[PDB]
Design a protein around this ligand. Sequence first.
Ligand code: CLA
Ligand code: CLA
Ligand code: CLA
Ligand code: SF4
Ligand code: SF4
Lengths: 80, 165, 40, 67, 64, 124, 37, 144
Amino acid sequence: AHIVKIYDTCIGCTQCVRACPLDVLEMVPWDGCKASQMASAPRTEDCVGCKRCETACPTDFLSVRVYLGSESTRSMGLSY
Amino acid sequence: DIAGLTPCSESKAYAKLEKKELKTLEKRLKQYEADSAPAVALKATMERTKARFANYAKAGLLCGNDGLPHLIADPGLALKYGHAGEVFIPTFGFLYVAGYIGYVGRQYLIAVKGEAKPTDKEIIIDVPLATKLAWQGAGWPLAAVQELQRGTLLEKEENITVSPR
Amino acid sequence: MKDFTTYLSTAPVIATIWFTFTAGLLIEINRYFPDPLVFS
Amino acid sequence: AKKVKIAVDRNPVETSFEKWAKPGHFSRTLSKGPNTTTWIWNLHADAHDFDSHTSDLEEISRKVFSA
Amino acid sequence: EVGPKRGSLVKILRPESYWFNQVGKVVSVDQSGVRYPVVVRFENQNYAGVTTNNYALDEVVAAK
Amino acid sequence: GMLETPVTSAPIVATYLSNLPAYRTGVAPVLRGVEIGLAHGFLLAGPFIKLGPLRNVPETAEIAGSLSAAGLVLILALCLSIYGSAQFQSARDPLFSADGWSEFAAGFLVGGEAGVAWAYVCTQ
Amino acid sequence: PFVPPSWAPSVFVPLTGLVLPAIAMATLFVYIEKEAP
Amino acid sequence: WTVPTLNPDTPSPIFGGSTGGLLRKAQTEEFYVITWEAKKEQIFEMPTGGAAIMRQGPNLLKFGKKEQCLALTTQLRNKFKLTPCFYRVFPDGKVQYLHPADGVYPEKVNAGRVGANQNMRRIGQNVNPIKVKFSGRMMSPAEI
Ligand code: CLA
Ligand code: CLA
Ligand code: CLA
Ligand code: SF4
Ligand code: SF4
């Protein structure tokens, strides 16, 4: 399973959640930004490591980071 | 002479080389007419070949056992034995032109940084400004040194972005 | 005509003229001073 | 039974050097001008990709015919 | 009443920022006590094409 | 579902496969091993004899080729055995089990070598 | 005393080139495929 | 909102079939089922290749991996404006429901969700790799 971390520079644009092609991320309430919402990664066991979320994050440096880790059938994206 | 070399004017191999090149040209000549277009061109080549070998010998170059000119790069050996024109003098000839080109480009780049849209002044050149800076670059060594002494040549370390370390 | 002269000021057009000029100067120098090897 | 006939439009475009002085005019993305050197390569890469400049088939066909 | 004035120029001090040691224009400063209220705009885009970013009060200093 | 096709789904093809030793259930794995081994073993001798390095020798060609076919059957028998060890470590057919495959590999060796020997007898 | 027999290559070359590799590959293939208890 | 229950007898779209469908994995490890309601019969594109006609009313499809189900979900939602949901089905007969986990699509913030894998710091405030060395396994400074 890969590791996905959300850092406190998130502005709650939701672009990472929309970009993710496996519904790994979601938005949750927060008080640390104007949007009052923060990205969350509750389902990292389904993450494949495409890093589409990082491509979509506007903040600099990124507020969502993916660290490729142990491989499995789900993370290796196999249908066989 | 220097490093065992000998003047090309006194080199046996150097003289033999000239005959070989002229002999090759002469062989092709005798298959044409006296004043045909090919014959005139070949004769012109032979004249340049003879002139070239006279000029290199007259220049006082050094030839090796190969009978080909060799150049001296040490400034001390060059000025000692009058070989300054091979490498030493051309060294300062190139740097003047190289600094000229670089200094002119740097002046233009600074000039447009003040404009509203510097990027559009780089793809689309401001020719009137470029020509103005092109002529003023002849004195770049003087202008370049004065910038160095006044401390405006280099940026401050605090105004340059660097990666985490 | 202002726009046309602006087109001639674009980078590819300037480079073509500049290198055409620069190359021509070098070619002409070697035409009148053939085989330069030493300043002399 | 649409008849086969000659069909044209008169003076569709104006002949001017204005756009010769505005690189990238054909594309919305590149029309804003360069900020990085990547813009320069994108200009030449997409110059003849008519199908991506406009979604109008008629405009695409007319460019192909004259090209 | 918190942070630099709108439209003023500030120098960025975040080492992990693309614009570290570079000058940008302040667009707005949030007064809601958020973590990174200061918004700065830059004339040169970063590797992702972005030209704006949010910074904390202590990560930005006035030009010079 | 899967793309239907006469090759994948035809009556004549299905019946032919169902009669092959591999798919003929109800037969002891050892017996299926012998039946499969004999067929492959008999064929395996052909190419070695005709195209081997000693093919042009009058009488040594038959012996050398068949002896090499016997060797290849021995190597194949090892491949069958270790495959069963790796695959079956912990279903309808007895063959696909640790006990069944071990018998299957043993039968293949006995049948295969018999087929190679039987092929040699045909020549001489 | 040291000199090996003149037939040593005939035995050792096939042994180390065809036999031991076969056992080594079989040993390694079984080992990697083996499942933990 | 309550967790929907899958109906295995739901009709499936009109599709001839292809070679890009389920493999032996579906029979041994798991597969995925996506269901949705269709306002009218329409042609859509199968993520496995080809075109299929969705019947009016409920529709059901089976796919080999999760990404295929969520790829079809994006098509149906964005273009045809439908609202699909899919499950994970195991060979033992168990059915697991997901997307939407709580009934609301993750793009929209919803109360009751608990933040996960959230670090209350920036990327630049992680410790150096030397400080997480010999921790029993390869560990990034972001993990701690
Ligand atoms: C790139 C490095 C380099 C090297 C390896 C040499 C090597 C040499 N140089 Mg040259 N030289 C160089 C750069 C170099 N030079 C530069 C940049 C300049 C200034 C433009 C000179 C100016 C120069 C002069 C004026 C003379 C030499 C001479 C020499 C020779 C002996 C002395 C010497 O320099 O010893 C090794 C070199 C170095 C340690 C580097 C510095 C050398 C200084 C600049 C010159 C030393 C001259 C020396 C005191 C002369 C004493 C008399 C000599 C007959 C023994 C030797 C072949 C002498 C010569 O012609 O000998 C036949 C000589 O008269 N050089
Ligand atoms: C594919 C390429 C190829 C081919 C066709 C051959 C062919 C041959 N090689 Mg050469 N060789 C090759 C590549 C090849 N070699 C390479 C790359 C090397 C370097 C490593 C060598 C090194 C080499 C050596 C050192 C020697 C040969 C020798 C031979 C001969 C005997 C081989 C043998 O015993 O096969 C045995 C064959 C089989 C066990 C079966 C072959 C495959 C069968 C026919 C498939 C049939 C399938 C069937 C049609 C399917 C039916 C399906 C249906 C029932 C549904 C033969 C002429 C030997 C010789 O003496 O040559 C004169 C020899 O000493 N080769
Ligand atoms: C060091 C490794 C090695 C060795 C010792 C050999 C040895 C041999 N190879 Mg080569 N080969 C090798 C590596 C090796 N190979 C590799 C790596 C490749 C792939 C690149 C090949 C590919 C290759 C081909 C394609 C061919 C050979 C063939 C041969 C034979 C050539 C001489 C001959 O006329 O035999 C004649 C052979 C005999 C008279 C019979 C010898 C004994 C047989 C093969 C086995 C007997 C087993 C026995 C009955 C029961 C098990 C006993 C055991 C448990 C002790 C010989 C058996 C040729 C051949 O004839 O192969 C069969 C041939 O066509 N080899
Ligand atoms: S991680 Fe990036 S893309 Fe996702 S909500 Fe935060 S700022 Fe937006
Ligand atoms: S790496 Fe890919 S699968 Fe993982 S969270 Fe990012 S976008 Fe989703």
